[PDB]
């Protein structure tokens, strides 16, 4: 029954809005100009960065640390969202942990695209905008940190998905039965099956003229895997070049594959 799938799509979108304070709908309103009361302050260099802190220790390190906090906060939002996916909290606790461990960064980059355009990324709940060029000019090895995320976003954003679409896609990512170390794959696959059915119907109804959007979206999951791997390799470099900088415990536990 497509009625049961629509109900599921609704539930997930409702939960998504309740779990993520900054939606794509709001991110785009800020970025496009449906503003006057939502205009962000733009950081494109040092002085503007200094000016930014006023109404929003080398530069690179500070920016990376703030980035760590936001990532940790995002893990929290995603964990809260995960609990609303029917069947998730009823799985073996060890598996719930494994799914989150491997799913959170793929979700972080998927949603990060909502805050990006080819010129930069929204920061601090949308109050600021840091240009891609500025980030690209940070000393090594931080200058190459975000570039791959922007490249992904530019392409991913071309799919023109909205929050109701993303809510289901994110649920699909979390319930991946192929994650390393899963104890009971079957119950997870059965849940993903239902989620895949919901995503398929949603895309057909929400994007009637977008042929094979469903398949094109699932293929993006390959891009997300890639991004994580490179990111991990870059993190390895930072660990060794900055021995005076500390990586957040939660994040360390996540990468401790």
Ligand X SMILES: CCCCC/C=C\C=C\[C@@H](O)CCCCCCCC(=O)O
Interaction between residue 41 and ligand X (CB under 6 A): no
Among 52, 77, 164, 172, binds ligand X (CB under 6 A): 77
Q: Quick one: 72 or 218, whose CB is closer to ligand X?
A: 72
Per CB under 6 A, contacts with ligand X among 139-158 are 142, 145-146
Among 12, 111, 174, 182, binds ligand X (CB under 6 A): 111
127 is in an annotated binding site: no
Interaction between residue 166 and ligand X (CB under 6 A): no
Q: Quick one: 198 or 227, whose CB is closer to ligand X?
A: 227
Among 71, 96, 164, 176, binds ligand X (CB under 6 A): 71
Concatenating the DSSP letter of every residue in the chain gives -HHHHHHHHHHHHHHHHHH-SS-HHHHHHHHHT--SSSPPEEE-SHHHHHHHHH----HHHHHHHHHHHHHHHHHHHHHHHHHTSTTGGGS-HHHHHHHHHHHHHHHHHHHHGGGEETTEEEEGGGTEEEEHHHHHTSPTTTTTSSHHHHHHHHHHHTT---HHHHHHHHHHHHS-TT-TT-S-HHHHHHHHHHHHHHHHHHHHHH-TTSTTHHHHHHHHHHHHHHHHHHHHHHHHHHHHH-TT----HHHHHHH--
CB of 1 to ligand X, least distance (A): 31
Q: Quick one: 194 or 234, whose CB is closer to ligand X?
A: 234
Among 49, 59, 64, 242, binds ligand X (CB under 6 A): 64
Contact positions vs ligand X (CB under 6 A):
20-22, 63-64, 66-68, 70-71, 73-74, 77, 108, 111-112, 114-115, 121-125, 130, 135, 142, 145-146, 251
Residue numbers belonging to the annotated binding site for rosiglitazone:
68-71, 105, 231, 255
């Amino acid at each position: 029954e497509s009625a049961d799938l629509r109900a599921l799509a609704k539930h997930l979108y409702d939960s998504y809005i309740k779990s993520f304070p900054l939606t794509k709908a709001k991110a785009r309103a800020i970025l496009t100009g449906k503003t006057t009361d939502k205009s962000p302050f733009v950081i494109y260099d040092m002085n503007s960065l200094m000016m930014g802190e006023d109404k929003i220790k080398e530069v690179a390190i500070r920016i990376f640390q703030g980035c760590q906090f936001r990532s940790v906060e995002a893990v929290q939002e995603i964990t809260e969202y995960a609990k609303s996916i029917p069947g998730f909290v009823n799985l073996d606790l060890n598996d719930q942990v494994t799914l989150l461990k491997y799913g959170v960064h793929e979700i972080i980059y998927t949603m990060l695209a909502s805050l990006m355009n080819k010129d930069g990324v929204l920061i601090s709940e949308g109050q600021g905008f840091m240009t891609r060029e500025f980030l690209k000019s940070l000393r090594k090895p931080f200058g190459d940190f975000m570039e791959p995320k922007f490249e992904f976003a530019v392409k991913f954003n071309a799919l023109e998905l909205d929050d109701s679409d993303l809510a289901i896609f994110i649920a699909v990512i979390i319930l991946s039965g192929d994650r390393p170390g899963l104890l009971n794959v079957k119950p997870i696959e059965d849940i993903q099956d239902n989620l895949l059915q919901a995503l398929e119907l949603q895309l057909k109804l929400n994007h009637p003229e977008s042929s094979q959007l469903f398949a094109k979206l699932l293929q993006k999951m390959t891009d997300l895997r890639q991004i994580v791997t490179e990111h991990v390799q870059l993190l390895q470099v930072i660990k060794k070049t900055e021995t005076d900088m500390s990586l957040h415990p939660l994040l360390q536990e996540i990468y401790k594959d």
